[PDB]
Amino acid sequence: DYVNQEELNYLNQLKDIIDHGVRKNDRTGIGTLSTFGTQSRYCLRDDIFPLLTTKRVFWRGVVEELLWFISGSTNAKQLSEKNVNIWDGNSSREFLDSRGLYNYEEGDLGPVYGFQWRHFGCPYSSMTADYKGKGYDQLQQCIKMIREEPESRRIIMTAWNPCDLEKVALPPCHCFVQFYVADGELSCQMYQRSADMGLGVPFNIASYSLLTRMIAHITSLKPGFFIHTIGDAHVYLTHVDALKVQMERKPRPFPKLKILRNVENIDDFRAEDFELINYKPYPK
Amino acid sequence: DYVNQEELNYLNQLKDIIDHGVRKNDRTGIGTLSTFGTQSRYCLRDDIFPLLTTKRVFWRGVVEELLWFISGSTNAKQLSEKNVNIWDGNSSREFLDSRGLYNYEEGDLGPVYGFQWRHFGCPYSSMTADYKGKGYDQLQQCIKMIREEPESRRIIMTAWNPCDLEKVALPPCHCFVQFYVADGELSCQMYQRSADMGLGVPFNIASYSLLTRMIAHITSLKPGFFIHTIGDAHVYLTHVDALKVQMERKPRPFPKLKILRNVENIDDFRAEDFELINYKPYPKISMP
Ligand SMILES: O=c1ccn([C@H]2C[C@H](O)[C@@H](COP(=O)(O)O)O2)c(=O)[nH]1
Ligand SMILES: O=c1ccn([C@H]2C[C@H](O)[C@@H](COP(=O)(O)O)O2)c(=O)[nH]1
Structure with missing residues (x-):
């Protein structure tokens, strides 16, 4: 009798929201x-890796998006050309015009995650400019702090710059990250302002857990915990029936994740470096 | 009798860190x-207000500091004139020289909380420059969104700007704030990267709860919840015996907080606008 306690908690959290959450409208008049x-x-x-088993998660998307964020890119065409289309809808001519971003070319999301991570505070012009050496490279500064002052309670990476809110196709959801080291293990906490429990959360858990493994590898630490903290945790009313069905399913054990190479630094990671062992989700 | 469950939970979290926390040295050289x-x-x-009862919390400090954060000031002397001296250590001639801020005058804290709340992203020069209408006024933007777009999942106020970290004595501890409105009630979640469970947390809880009450009051909402999320939650080793004492005390019911007049905007509050009803704390506890 194996119990996946972590996934069960997630299912209970869905149930609690479904049964006791408050009705709220989203910014499109749709209900949650x-x-x-x-x-x-x-x-x-x-090496246990919290990829959810009760509905298949798009792991190839998690990996490629994350390596794209780490590169500092803001051009969704660079993902799309790797057959990952998750940012295509928010970088269309038409969607960009609806955001008032008339001078962005198609694919230009503005200064979203990767730009904030690697170039915080640099003025944004477009996705083709070279920002190398410009702004605050928070990701490298966190890695330096991990290695040089692991006791530090200031190991933070923010994606939230209110001065950039009018320049972005959509405002960041995974807002704030902190790292912690104790007893030779690396932990990460991420603060998510708004989380769709059905469609967003499972992918989010996987991106941050994977970032945690990456950083622990190139700082010579063992992995500890990923802590996910949410502001508005919600489910859409139109999803409620499908999620009820998912909730009848019995979670299976989590896969494991190995890193297959001695990777040089955070910018040297490649998709083939990660091996997901025994991921066995139900459908979807 | 009455059971103060929220205060018992705090005491249980104290117990847990003390009994099961990892030993970790820190910047201060004291261990945690x-x-x-x-x-x-x-x-x-x-109107119930989570001011801890197993020790006397520095309420007058909480109120004056928050009004001073709200003003956008970064001059500790403006707080010191209210006989609240908690920022004086970090703004002495002597102490600033040590962080290599030789050009700041005594009292100049750099762009700490108030500057970030009212003027985010404006370049900081000194505590005496005119910042009025410069930078991004997050606090008033959050107020406007609560009034105009209460359902929004983007009502955020950040205190964390990596470009400003080398300009302040100490980087902000209470970093990130989100507001939320549902069924006519305003809630607030605050993310604290670093929390001294003895000396800081009780004060910190009171600070954000009071801010939540203030905003609820000017937006004609009911107060809901304050949710406190912490990164590194710690006790200093030197505090443990004193916290041991505190943990044997039986929590009393929390006081109530009343606001005594109609206030229309966030900058219009005075210390005397707030009335604590029936705060019955045990005596104060001193900890290095
Ligand atoms: O990484 C993400 C990005 C978005 N969302 C969901 C949360 C909301 O349902 C919606 C974003 O809408 P706003 O919070 O910005 O209104 O997308 C996620 O769950 N994870
Ligand atoms: O409002 C505050 C400010 C500071 N601290 C505590 C947390 C730490 O013990 C110390 C700050 O040190 P660093 O985390 O910056 O090292 O002060 C608080 O608990 N609350």
Whole structure:
């Protein structure tokens, strides 16, 4: 009798939102059921990797998006050319015009995650400019702090710059990240302002857990926990029936994740460096 | 009798860190016992106000500091004139020289919380420059969104600007704030990267709860919850015996907080606008 306690908690969180969450409208007039303020822990020990089993997660998308974020790119065509189309809808001529971004060419999302991570505070012009050496490279500064002052309680990476809100196709959801080191293990906490529990959360858990493994590898630490903290945790009313069905499913054990190469630095990671062992989701 | 569950939870979290926390040295050279990633909820309904009762919290400090944060000031002397001296250590001639801020005058804290709340992204020169209408006024933007777009999932106020870290004595601890409105009630979640469970947390909880009450009051909403999320939650080793004492005390019911006049905007509050009803704390506890 194996119990995947972490995935069960996630299912219980869906149930609680479904049964007791408050009705709320989203910014398109569509309805959700919502709660405010949740926190969930995922153990990364023994290579165990919290990819959800009760509905298949788009792992190839998680990996490629993340390596794209780390590169500092803001051009969704660079993802799309790798057959990952998740940012295509928010970088169309038409969507960009609806955001008032008339001078962005198709693919230009403005200064979204990767730009904030690697170039915080640099003025944005477009996705083709070279920003190398410009702004604050928070990602490298976090890595330096991990290696040089692991006790530090200031190991932070922010994606939230209100001065950039009018320049972005959409405002960041995964807003704030902190790292922590104790007893030779690296942990990460991420703060997510708004989380769709059905479609967003599972992919989010996987991106940050994978970032945690990456950083622990190139800082010579063992992985500890990923902590996910949410502001508005919600499910869309139109999803409620499908999620009820998912909730009848019995979670299976999490896969494991190995890193296959001695990677030089955070910018040297390649998709083939990661091996996902025994991922066995139900459909979807 | 009455059971103060939120205060018992705090005491239980103290117990947990003390009994099961990892030993971790720190910047200060004192060691800590530490856990990473905690979350606690405080109910603000029926005017109940989460000021801890197992020790006397520095309420007058909480109120004056928050009014001073709201003003956008970065001059500790403006707080010191209110006989609240908690920022004086970090703004002495002597102390600033040590962080290599030789050009700041005494009292100049750099762009700490108030500057970030009212003037985010404006370049900082000194505490005496005119910042009026410069930078991004996050606090008033959050107020406007609560009034105009209460359903929004983007009501955010950040205090974290990597470009400003080398300009302040100490980087902000209470970093990130989100507001939320549902069924006519305003809630607030605050993310704290670093929390001294003895000396800081009780004060910190009172600070954000009070901010939530203030905003609820000017937006004609009911107060809902304050949710406190922490990164590194720690106790200093030197504090443990004193916290041991505190943990044997039986929490009392929280006080109520009343606001005594109609206030229309965030900058218009005075210290005397707030009335604590029936705060019955045990005596103060001193900790290095
Ligand atoms: O990484 C993400 C990005 C978005 N969303 C969901 C949350 C909301 O349902 C919607 C974003 O809408 P706003 O919070 O910005 O209104 O997308 C996620 O769950 N994860
Ligand atoms: O509002 C505050 C400010 C500071 N601290 C504590 C946390 C740490 O013990 C110390 C700051 O040190 P660093 O985390 O910056 O090292 O002050 C608080 O708890 N609350």
